[PDB]
Each structure stands twice: as structure tokens, then as C-alpha cells.
Amino acid sequence: EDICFIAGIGDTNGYGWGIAKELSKRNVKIIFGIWPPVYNIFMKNYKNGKFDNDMIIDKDKKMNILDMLPFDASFDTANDIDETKNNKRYNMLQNYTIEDVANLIHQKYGKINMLVHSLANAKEVQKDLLNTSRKGYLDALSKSSYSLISLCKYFVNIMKPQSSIISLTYHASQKVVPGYGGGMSSAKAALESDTRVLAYHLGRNYNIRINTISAGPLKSRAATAITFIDYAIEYSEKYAPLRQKLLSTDIGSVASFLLSRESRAITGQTIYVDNGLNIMFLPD
Amino acid sequence: EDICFIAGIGDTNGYGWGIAKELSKRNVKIIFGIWPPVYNIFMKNYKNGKFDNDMIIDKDKKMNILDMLPFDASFDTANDIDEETKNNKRYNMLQNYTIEDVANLIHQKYGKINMLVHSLANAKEVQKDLLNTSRKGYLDALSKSSYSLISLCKYFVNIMKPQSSIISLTYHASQKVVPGYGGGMSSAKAALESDTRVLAYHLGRNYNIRINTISAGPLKSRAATAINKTFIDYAIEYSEKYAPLRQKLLSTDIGSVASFLLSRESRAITGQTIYVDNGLNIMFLPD
Ligand SMILES: NC(=O)c1ccc[n+]([C@@H]2O[C@H](COP(=O)([O-])OP(=O)(O)OC[C@H]3O[C@@H](n4cnc5c(N)ncnc54)[C@H](O)[C@@H]3O)[C@@H](O)[C@H]2O)c1
Ligand SMILES: NC(=O)c1ccc[n+]([C@@H]2O[C@H](COP(=O)([O-])OP(=O)(O)OC[C@H]3O[C@@H](n4cnc5c(N)ncnc54)[C@H](O)[C@@H]3O)[C@@H](O)[C@H]2O)c1
Ligand SMILES: Cc1cc(=O)oc2cc(Oc3ccc(Cl)cc3O)ccc12
Ligand SMILES: Cc1cc(=O)oc2cc(Oc3ccc(Cl)cc3O)ccc12
To answer: Which residues of B belong to the active site?
Structure first.
């Protein structure tokens, strides 16, 4: 059978959940990587049934969640954790670095064949690029971009040949969006470029594919935290070629396709799933 | 149940067949629009079972083709057909083959459809480089390979349901230099990709109809062979040696991507150029 690890789920309002739902229609087994500071909250909500409606796929099936594990994209191996190891919210957790989660998944379930990067962070996202500190900019690149490379480096060993990987990006990398601050734009630019270079190395060495989905705006918790997202949604719904509301499951079905054998000849691409908004220059 | 019109199938060796095959696999009904110069040949081979093996999808599934119609994308309406073509040996027996007439025929026979495939190209001077292409040659390339998409859309939107989907096929020579891709074919593909955007805007807003284009890698189709003065053998060998994915690119690889874009699974995607080429487009320097 097929197993997908999804790194970057904090709740049911994001793209990670949508991707999980859609993969579920194809009977893919799902493992969630959850950022430790919100891990116990998530587990609490889940156990309390808060996500039950959200887990419903169709009349016949609910989402098959194989496992849920703490996962922090800041840390490559156990050797990289600063203190933090004993922070209030990290202390009762273990094995949450990228390599540790890879070893854990492999130990419990064997090899997987789908990998989803669905996470971003930037401590200074509220500042515009020109007022971003070095520390802030590098945090953004570290968490939003390098984490993709690191995820690939540790997970290829536990993947099958002809496996497939995706991440999520945003058009601010290619065209200016004021409000998308703190080096987030820069991080998505690196991410899209890295997707190509990784596609070369993964393709030639392992026959593994990798692509990125450039999504349109979604009112996820993180987006709301940057409002900017309300403007972006209102603007997209007024001016995109397609005026339907953009759903997380619209990204999910594209992700589902890029992660399956049906897209076997697609790699290294940035695929726009945004109701066509990226193609517009002058709003009518 | 889904119905797709595929414009530009002349045999089992091009991308059109690969697209048909992948669609039938998902139980989409398929209508072939076939250029009149090859129409009788195709029908005959079909009736004689020459395509039987190629129609084998897998171990216990075979393609079903709903219909096969003469179709010439050079002509918008019956009034556009010049006297010479109308009376030509290969056209004189055929009817309803203009873009307007085939849409009308399809609608009358089957009602509204929901998928449309543009899988054709033509260019009289493809063997010349751009600088040595005549005005007539260039405009022929644009007319046949690019305008034909606009016209197909203009007439087929009235016989398509909302939420329907359209695709065409392009090539990376539009965006980066491929010296042997002559005769204004490069220009035509540039225009096709740009028109795909503008059309996505008009069709999206007014019809809730989506349109995209697939930039395919090289395939040894009958038409690809006509390029050399081979060009396609070089392109294929180069692709298999240098792409991130080093495996033979198949027509059905394009076909399954086409199927995805034609389906509701891709409802938030429109106006896009999607590359299906084993990743070759992302390379700068061959290692
Ligand atoms: N919301 C949008 O409009 C939008 C648009 C385009 C792309 N995206 C991308 O989609 C992805 C998901 O974003 P979302 O909008 O669904 O937000 P989200 O809140 O659903 O998810 C982002 C997740 O990343 C997790 N995360 C943050 N730092 C982490 C770390 N250090 N280690 C592990 N996990 C960490 C968060 O807990 C959060 O759950 C992101 O890559 C984002 O850039 C979002
Ligand atoms: N073969 C490749 O390496 C390659 C690469 C990228 C893109 N493409 C594109 O894919 C599409 C299909 O090409 P192919 O290589 O599969 O060749 P093909 O020979 O299979 O298809 C071209 C078809 O178009 C038909 N045609 C030409 N002019 C027509 C007209 N006036 N009206 C109706 N039909 C007409 C021909 O009969 C032929 O069957 C074309 O758009 C081509 O540019 C091909
Ligand atoms: C700063 C930050 C933290 C986090 O956890 O997720 C994030 C997810 C983020 O996702 C986005 C939201 C809206 C848009 Cl339009 C694009 C996005 O990339 C951004 C920023 C963060
Ligand atoms: C001139 C011409 C006539 C025709 O019927 O089909 C064509 C199909 C063509 O398809 C291609 C083949 C190879 C490559 Cl690499 C790209 C293509 O666009 C080109 C040109 C023609």
C-alpha cells in the first residue's frame, strides 16, 4: 500500500489537511508531522472529536490517520537541539527532529512513497523585507526552505523508488506582494529554485520526483496570523479567471495527482493552483 | 458521463492517441477529429484491425471510440472553404469538417460535451529556420497551429457544459531556442501559450470553462519525423541522456496528465503551461 508523511499540520484549516483528505480518497495511509508547540493541543482536539466532521471523506469512509508524531523542521538531528529540549512544550516529547522522525517512521512502518512539505515559518513575517534582521531572514530560510532539503536528505533512505515529493509555495517569490514580509518571499524563491536542483539529484540518483504547488490564498490559522489574508482572498475572488472559492481540497487533489504515478513525467515544476490568478496583469 | 473531442489524430503514434488511450481508461467517451488527407487511411486501418493492439489499454481493458469525424482546423465555417479544397480528391466526398460544422454535428448527435483536446500543429516551412521563413509560411504556421485553438474554443464553448476543460499541446522552443524547430513553429507555440492565458481569462469569467496547455517532451510521431531535412532522434536521445528522469517519455505519460487537467481534479488550475517532459526543461548545463 501507499504511505504519505505530511509535515506541517496544526489543525484542519490549512493546506496539509486538505492534502490529507484528498489522498484519503485514494486509500493512502497518512502520517502527520506536527510542530511540537501545538502537538498536545492537536492531540487533545483530536481525542475530543473536534476533527471528526473534518475527517469524513464520503458516505463510506473517514480519513485513515496511521500516526501522528511531533516534528520540528528547525532541527536536523538530535545533535542540533539547543534549553529548548527542556522547554515547557518540548520536554514531554522526544524524537522530533527530521532524522529522528525518519528513523521512527521507518522503524514502525517501513518504507513510504509520498512526502509532503507543508510548513513555513518566519519570526519577522510582519516586517517588510527591507526592515528584516539577519536573524529573522535566516530563520525564514531555515524553517521554510532548508527544511525541504533536509527532509529530502533524511527521507530518501526510507522511500521506495518512483516515490514522489511535494511542497507548497506562493507567487510572492516571483512578483511583489507587500505584506508578505520577513524573508518569506525570499524563502519561497529559494524553495522553488531548490525544487529544480533537488529534482535533478533525486531524479538521476533515485528516480524520485519532486514538485511544488504554488497555492492561492487560504484562510488558514498561520495566514490569519500575518488582515493581509482577507485582502488577498477578496482580491483573488474578485479578479481571478475562475471566481469559485479556493478550497484546501483544491490543492489536495492536485497534490494527490503529483504524488501518484499519473504524473510520472513531471518533476522539478512549480504548479500554480490558484484559480488562474497568477496569469493576470491588469485588473479589469 | 464524460465526452471528449480530440482534434488532431492521424494514427497511433502521436500524443493524441496517448491522450485518447488514457481517457478511455477512465471511461471518458472519445470522439476523434481526423484531418481529411489521412481520414480514409485511418478509417481503413481501423476497420482492418490494424489498431487493435494499440487499443489494448491493459490485460482486460480495451479502448472504445465513440466516433471519428473528418476535421480540418484550417476552416472556421463552410463559407471559409475555398473551391479548390472543396473539390479536392480527398475532401470532395467529405462534409461537416469545418470547426463550426463539426461542433454542430457533435452537438446534434451527442448533446453537450465537457472536454476538448487540441492536439494538432502544421507549418509549410518547418524545415527552414525562422530567418528564412516566408511571410506566407509563418502565417500558415500561426493559422494552423495557433489560431485554430482560438476558433475551436469560440465554436465549442456553446456545446460545452460549465466546468468543462480544454487542453492543447505546446513545446519549450517557444521559450528557449531549439534551432531545428523552424518555419514559425516556435512562434506559433509562443502565441499558443500566451493565448492560453488570455483565453483562460475570457472562458473562466464568462463560462466557468478552464483551459491549459501541456508542454511535452519529444515523441517520435509521424509529424516529428517530417521536421528533418533526424531532428527528433537527436531531441529524444538528448532528453533520455540529460533529463532528471532518464526513461523513455511515452505518449500515455502526456495522456495521463491530459486526463488529470481535463477532469474535475484540476478545477483550480487554468491558463497554465504544464511541462511533461521528464524534467528536461529545468536543466541549463548538460553534465
Ligand atoms: N495560506 C495560504 O494562503 C498559503 C498560500 C500559498 C502557500 N501556502 C503554504 O502552505 C503551507 C501550509 O501553510 P498554511 O497556510 O496551510 O498554514 P498552516 O497553519 O495550516 O500550516 C503551516 C504549518 O507549519 C507548521 N510549522 C511552523 N513551523 C514549523 C516548524 N518549525 N517545524 C514543523 N512545523 C512547523 C505550523 O504548525 C503549521 O501547522 C506553507 O508552506 C505555506 O507557505 C499557504
Ligand atoms: N512529437 C513531439 O515531440 C511533440 C512535442 C511537443 C509538442 N507536440 C505537439 O503535440 C501535438 C500533436 O503532435 P504529434 O507530434 O503528436 O504529431 P501527430 O502527427 O501525431 O499529430 C499532428 C496531427 O495533426 C493533424 N493536423 C495537421 N493539420 C491539421 C489541420 N489543419 N486540421 C486538423 N488536423 C490537422 C495531422 O493529421 C496529425 O494527425 C502538436 O500540437 C505538437 O506540436 C509534439
Ligand atoms: C510566519 C508563518 C508561520 C507558520 O507557521 O506558517 C506560516 C504559513 C504561511 O503561509 C502563507 C499564508 C498566506 C499566504 Cl498568501 C501565503 C503563505 O505562504 C505564511 C507564514 C507562516
Ligand atoms: C509541420 C507539422 C505538421 C503536422 O501535421 O504535425 C506537426 C507536429 C509537430 O509536432 C512536434 C514534433 C516534434 C517536436 Cl519536438 C515538437 C512538435 O511540435 C510539429 C510540426 C508538424
So the answer is: 171, 181
